[PDB]
Design a protein around this ligand. Structure first.
Ligand SMILES: CC(C)CCC[C@@H](C)[C@H]1CC[C@H]2[C@@H]3CC=C4C[C@@H](O)CC[C@]4(C)[C@H]3CC[C@]12C
Length: 251
């Protein structure tokens, strides 16, 4: 009893860390190790040429399909975050609309080869050149730069899990009803994230460097929306008839 009391604090942090870490583990398609083992499998020059030969709307539709697949996993992750299912549906939707793609871009660092500037896409590791047909060179550059930036931190799976849960449970999203409840949940997550970070590298104070990225994510995801809207303006029927419904619902 007395021992249990002496441990209650750190125990709680560890319990929350382990819970989120498990949820992350169980909602990623591949193990970190599996992705790392195949970074050499880049697209062949002919394959790259084939993607570049695709028409803008074709490449867009493909990217939307693949993003949506990743988002599905993120939705499963969200469902497992304690507190998330207790929120009103309105807030669950607001949080997912804003944060699902943020988590996708965080998860990207696991499937990103920083040394070679490539990302796991459609079966193999893709350089920026693979995405030329989108007509979004600056955005693609931004994505890969973010990949490199986040990779530079050498985040563990648990760190990614907790950081993902942190940006998802953001109390400052527009239009939230239960801001105070969400804020309290995020605070608890931040403490567990800090707990997990200084367990590996008390060499620095990277928590702030991590939270610094929070702003970049928002900008990156903001750009994605802006571009999707411009694309939709030009190809309304492609979006209506050929884009994944979940993607349309979210964005
Ligand atoms: C204008 C928009 C649609 C262009 C988006 C193009 C690129 C950046 C998108 C298309 C498909 C996306 C990938 C789809 C699936 C995954 C698997 C997930 O476990 C980590 C992120 C990762 C690897 C995504 C990273 C970003 C990605 C490669």
């Amino acid at each position: 009893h007395h021992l249990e009391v002496l441990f209650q604090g750190p125990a709680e942090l560890e319990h929350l860390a382990q819970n989120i870490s498990k949820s992350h583990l169980e909602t990623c398609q591949y193990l970190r190790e599996e992705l790392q083992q195949i970074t050499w499998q880049t697209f062949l020059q002919e394959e790259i040429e084939n993607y570049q030969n695709k028409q803008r709307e074709v490449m867009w539709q493909l990217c939307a399909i693949k993003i949506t697949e990743a988002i599905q996993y993120v939705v499963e992750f969200a469902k497992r975050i304690d507190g998330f299912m207790e929120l009103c549906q309105n807030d669950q939707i607001v949080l997912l609309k804003a944060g699902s793609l943020e988590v996708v871009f965080i998860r990207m660092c696991r499937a990103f080869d920083s040394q070679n500037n490539t990302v796991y896409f459609d079966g193999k590791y893709a350089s920026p050149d693979v995405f030329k047909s989108l007509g979004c060179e600056d955005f693609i550059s931004f994505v890969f730069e973010f990949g490199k930036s986040l990779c530079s931190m050498h985040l563990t799976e648990d760190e990614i899990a907790l950081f993902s849960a942190f940006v998802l449970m953001s109390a400052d999203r527009s239009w939230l009803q239960e801001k105070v409840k969400i804020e309290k949940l995020q605070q608890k997550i931040q403490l567990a994230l800090q707990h997990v970070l200084q367990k590996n590298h008390r060499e620095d104070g990277i928590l702030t460097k991590l939270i610094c990225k929070v702003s970049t994510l928002r900008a990156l995801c903001g750009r994605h929306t802006e571009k999707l809207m411009a694309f939709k303006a030009i190809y309304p029927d492609i979006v209506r008839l050929h884009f994944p419904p979940l993607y349309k619902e979210l964005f």
